[PDB]
Amino acid sequence: NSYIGTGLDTSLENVKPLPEACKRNVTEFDLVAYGKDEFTLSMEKRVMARMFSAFDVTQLGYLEERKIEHMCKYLGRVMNEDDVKQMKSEINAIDGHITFEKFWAWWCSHPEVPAKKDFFSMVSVDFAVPYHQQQLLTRETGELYTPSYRVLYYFRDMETGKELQVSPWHDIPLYVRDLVRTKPASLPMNRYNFICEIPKWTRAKFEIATGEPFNPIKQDIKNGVPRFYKHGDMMWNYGALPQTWESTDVVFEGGYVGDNDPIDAIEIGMTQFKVGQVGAVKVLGILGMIDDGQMDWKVICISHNDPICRFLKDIHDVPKFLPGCLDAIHEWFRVYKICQGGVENKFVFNGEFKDKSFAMKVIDESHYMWGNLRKINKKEEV
Amino acid sequence: ANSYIGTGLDTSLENVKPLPEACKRNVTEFDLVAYGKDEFTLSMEKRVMARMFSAFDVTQLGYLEERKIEHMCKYLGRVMNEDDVKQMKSEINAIDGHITFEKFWAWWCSHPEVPAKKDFFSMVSVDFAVPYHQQQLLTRETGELYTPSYRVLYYFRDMETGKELQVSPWHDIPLYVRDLVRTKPASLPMNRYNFICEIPKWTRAKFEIATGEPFNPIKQDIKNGVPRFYKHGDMMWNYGALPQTWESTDVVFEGGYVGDNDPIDAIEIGMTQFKVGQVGAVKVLGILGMIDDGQMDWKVICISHNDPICRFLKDIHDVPKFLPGCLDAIHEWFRVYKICQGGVENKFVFNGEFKDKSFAMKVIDESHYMWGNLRKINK
Amino acid sequence: ANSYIGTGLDTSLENVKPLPEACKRNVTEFDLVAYGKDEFTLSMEKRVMARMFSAFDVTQLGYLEERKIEHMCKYLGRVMNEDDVKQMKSEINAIDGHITFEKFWAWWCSHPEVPAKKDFFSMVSVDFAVPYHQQQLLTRETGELYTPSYRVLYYFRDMETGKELQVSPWHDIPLYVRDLVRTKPASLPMNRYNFICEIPKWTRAKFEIATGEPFNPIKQDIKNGVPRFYKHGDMMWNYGALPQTWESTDVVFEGGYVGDNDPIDAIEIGMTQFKVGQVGAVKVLGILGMIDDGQMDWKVICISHNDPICRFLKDIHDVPKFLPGCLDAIHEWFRVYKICQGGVENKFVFNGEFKDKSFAMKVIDESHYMWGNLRKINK
Amino acid sequence: NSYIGTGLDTSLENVKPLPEACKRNVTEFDLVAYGKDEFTLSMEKRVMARMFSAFDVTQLGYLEERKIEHMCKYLGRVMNEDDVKQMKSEINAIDGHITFEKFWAWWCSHPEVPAKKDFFSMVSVDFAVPYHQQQLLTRETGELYTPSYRVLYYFRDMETGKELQVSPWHDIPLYVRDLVRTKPASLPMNRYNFICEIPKWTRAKFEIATGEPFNPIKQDIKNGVPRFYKHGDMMWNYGALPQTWESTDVVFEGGYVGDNDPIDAIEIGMTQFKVGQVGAVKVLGILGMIDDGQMDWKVICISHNDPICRFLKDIHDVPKFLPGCLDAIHEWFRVYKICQGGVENKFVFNGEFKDKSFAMKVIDESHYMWGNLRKINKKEEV
Ligand SMILES: [Mg+2]
Ligand SMILES: [Mg+2]
Ligand SMILES: [Mg+2]
Ligand SMILES: [Mg+2]
């Protein structure tokens, strides 16, 4: 804030502020921004004149018609091949030297074409990338608490409306990706899909049937009697991330001893998911538990739709808004087998909750192994 | 399914006896299985697989044939291959093929099926990847603010190659924010659009998408070298435009008003101020129809998906409940923002009512449709 | 009042001419005064104070007497003392006392009344201070956790003297959280109670207010030196008590159930875990009636005023809308938390329905009332 | 977590963990906490025995009956004058030396009185401090935009229901105080009452009439024409804090040049207050503007009922959740007079927003001067 600038490199010192500003003791910025009146023609002149001198770099007192033409395009005027001619004719400056007065006289007399505006620039990267969006659908079938119970998945082409059964394991994308991401680039990507197997506040077991076609969710029934966590209810939604695989075969050079299931995840928002429900989550960290000698990661995440999600930036924020959460999660997994004759479970990294960068890395390795699990089978049989 | 454990096939209550551990104690068997000590382990399993056996014994004869017994085992989830069935008969000492339950149970409780093997994984997946690389929108300011050199430029950063391109915010930023695989309830209509702030909340300096300039950057309205500002007061909401829309002057509304030639206008009512040119997903709540010099001039009312109360504003009727006075202020600001400069109040269609969301989004498709025709005729 | 500026006294539309600056331009005078340039300064004031003058000129004669002209000036807010009235007449050249408007206006537009003086301030205030010093609740743990030495003690820190006293959480923490001067809408019923967590969310170790111990600290339930824990599973909500309440065994409900002798029970359903003994304001949402060994055992359902969604849960019917599955889980947890140890399910009154808030708070006053009688009989 | 402790100072090393624990490889804590079964009588014995030895400090193999009596009261038993006698009689230990076996034998045989529990400790600081709570009421009267408009205030004794007119200026408490404050002491007090004079998104003027009886709110009407901010609407709720006074008389040694009105306040939540509406706010900072040479503080605060209040801890948090807010507030006050022929306003402290401790201090000085304004008048005339 001070005075109206031209927008080209200049110098303060010898520029005289419009008189109406000085008289009032208000800067020009302030007068044009907040003064209720518009600038007079007298006032615009003194401004355009300063613009003229700016363009007059060789400060010679006039400008060549090629400059006056850039200046015009700089001031916003649409100067086509025709218009430029009309200006020269108007100024009729045989030597092509145009004075300010002659310029200003011409400007004021030709507020250029009205509706000619009807020109719209259409340049565009034209990233013509069309696609039928799918809407995920789930359907239960069978009787709850029996072996027929299954939660099936389908995509609905919201274009054709055709339904197709899909595998929540292979078909639901792991990363939730925007075709054109609008969130600040300064903000890293953290948006994943999560599949609830066991809802918050419940102890009945369910899981993705990795062995059946389309990988529907089934109840864990053994000898015709549904299974349950006897230790107590679960208190967060427990589930899994799609397109991942904790291979029991080490598959790369820093490979661990997976358990052959999609990576496990715990979502800590306030809302209970229903069985097999899918939703976008934000990964906050991870906890490594040992299960029968196998590495059994539990990704800690929170639904993007929870009211506090936006304040939970990493795993250190959880004890700040959900005190007790990470302690209860840790203690619950350490001891859930003891009431069944088992013993406490052990954890890697001293049972500490690793942060999001660490989690996301584990999640990618898991995505990678899921990917290579596809290659081997998807290609060999084919 | 709150009493006893069912088979998963169409049955009947009355004639089924709840397993003895339940009756004696007064606890439904379901409650015993779910919350009692595992001691009601091998017992409740016998009683359930019994009734299940009796189910398959439909001609009620007291035994089952070897093709039934094996469909059950499948049903009880045992993984059997041609091989393992062979064993069963062999193990189940019965040269007539009639297998009682006790024979079955004792054999069931015999080994607990060959768990080793290669352990199978169904890979049947539907197919639907999309070859397109995700782009990260980038905005860059250049020039000097309040002079005609100021422009807010847009780019796409290929999140694949990391290559950048200049794009048009008008033509290239999608209007609908579409998920490749929408997970939110089917039951929940889609409502997610991009919004370009031109005029930030609490400010009064005029900015606009330069529809006539290549790549349509954002410019400040400057006339005769002097920047322009709303004299009525500051805009108290982010004011802007929806991309890929066009209110063509070649179109009239119920009365005799034509479109105004710019992308459609929008007002984002969250609490957060957007920076000039900033883009973000919003939810549409309704629309307000104003007339500007005989032209129809819609202002879509929307709220940032990032706003604390966004999930609670379902339709336009909800705004007065959580943001009292907002709709009145908006109406009044637009009704009179010209009186200070000599003009007169503006008039509205629909008696200045804020039309609901369904009505607004209809208006938006139409605006998206004409934009599309403009694309094709010129393309 | 959207057209022309009114006098503030009972009038009529029809016969009043909108000031000339309005008519010529097409803008109501109200809009000119509120949004046009102050140029419609001295003009619109003349026209308004004119009509006001004509109002007082009720016998419509064209002038007013010196006691009217001075009641107006009062009304137009000029502060006049016996003195200043003297001047007016003196200034207003009129020995008959009949003052036209032009005479008045020219004199009004003459000086703009003696602004100096001592400048007065009305000090009339109602009276109602309260001599009581505010206390800050303090809680202190002592002893060792999971042994019989563990107690959570309570104190009041006088925010005046800074002197501390041991208090009883049961008897001294107020049940109703009352503002000395409630500012929230009168239209909004009062709903703010204190809640004492005994058993934190996600834990299973038994803690209780020691009703038989002096100052009723919080103790862990230990029997025979061994601490006690719910075997069914963890409590998934903060579970506790409301202070200054008593479910006297000397009282029966509709059927034949008597109170259980402890303060009434509560379940706080927010997202945040409370520490053992922690106290906090909650909103009551409803109540669930359970029977425990023939005794009535209410569990008030409440939510921390500090919770993000608290303002959206108005009554018990709202919980399923924002916390789906919560009420079912609560019902089921209490229906069966004894089956694991050999017991049987518990039964409920009202068909296990969660009664609404009005019903619950009624139950709470009654519990507060009996607590009060217990105070007096023993005091 | 390890083994059941006695709760008195001891030593690890030579304490043998219950056999059932060792056999399982589960700690005792884990077995008693999460094991589904209760301890047997055999198991309680071995525990109570360790408790016995604890109390046996002189480790002599038995205890005097005065110890066994403390131990009992320590284990939770109610041992009145009578009960102690009954125990001695039971143990009949002529020398008063009580062995564990004899103790344990006695304990198991007397699970002490049932319903005798009917004893409730009633000790209480008995801070018997009763009071009729008042409910603030407001009523409009007159015609909006005329000189009769006023917003009146009353208290309703919610006991008697009697209504009494009050002064929002003198009667609404400045600090909102809980009789028994339950929020952690570790959390400083920040709860004030605020009176909206000018609602968010409006430009019509209103104010507390410090000159009229009961100090109702009136519209600013001059020459019969209501007044308005011509610069533009206000964008936050603008009002004042009750029981405060920016005296034009300096009143204490670091006294400034007040403007003779209650201190001004700007509440930045999302919700519009109606004229004269009162609500609890949290003070975040303050901005010092000069007005005609007079100090004219503007307290920046936010309603406790706004959804983000709980995340706004001090003035530095505002640019984090409400970017642009402090800039627009600052610029709005700097220039609101320019459109009326005035000039920009100046600020103390370089126009920077001071933090909450600084604000609250200013607010107290203001409360102090309001208080002394009462003394002088409230006493002299009386
Ligand atoms: Mg796993
Ligand atoms: Mg438009
Ligand atoms: Mg109770
Ligand atoms: Mg002030």
Structural description of this entry:
The PDB classes it as metal binding protein. The entry lists the keywords substrate binding, acidocalcisomal pyrophosphatase, metal binding protein. The assembly is tetrameric. 4 copies of one chain form a homotetramer. The first copy, chain A, has 382 residues and is of the alpha+beta class. Chain A folds into 2 domains: 19-117, EF-hand (Recoverin, domain 1, Orthogonal Bundle); 134-177 and 188-380, Inorganic pyrophosphatase (Inorganic Pyrophosphatase, Alpha-Beta Complex), CATH 3.90.80.10. Chain A has 10 helices and 16 strands. The first copy, chain A, has helices at 19-24, 28-34, 41-55, 65-74, 81-91, 100-109, 168-171, 318-321, 325-335, 356-380; strands at 63-64, 97-98, 134-141, 150-157, 163-166, 180-181, 192-198, 206-208, 217-219, 221-222, 225-226, 237-240, 264-267, 278-291, 294-303, 354-355. In chain A, strands 3, 4, 5, 8 and 9 form a 5-stranded antiparallel beta sheet that branches. In chain A, strands 7-12-13-15-14 form a 5-stranded mixed barrel. Chain A has a two-stranded antiparallel sheet with strand order 1-2. Chain A is elongated. Chain A starts with 18 loop residues before the first helix and ends with a helix. The interface between A and B is large, with 99 and 96 residues. Strand 6 of chain A pairs parallel with strand 1 (135-142) of chain B, so a sheet runs across the interface. Bound molecules: magnesium ion (4 copies). The site of one magnesium ion has 5 residues of chain A, from loops.
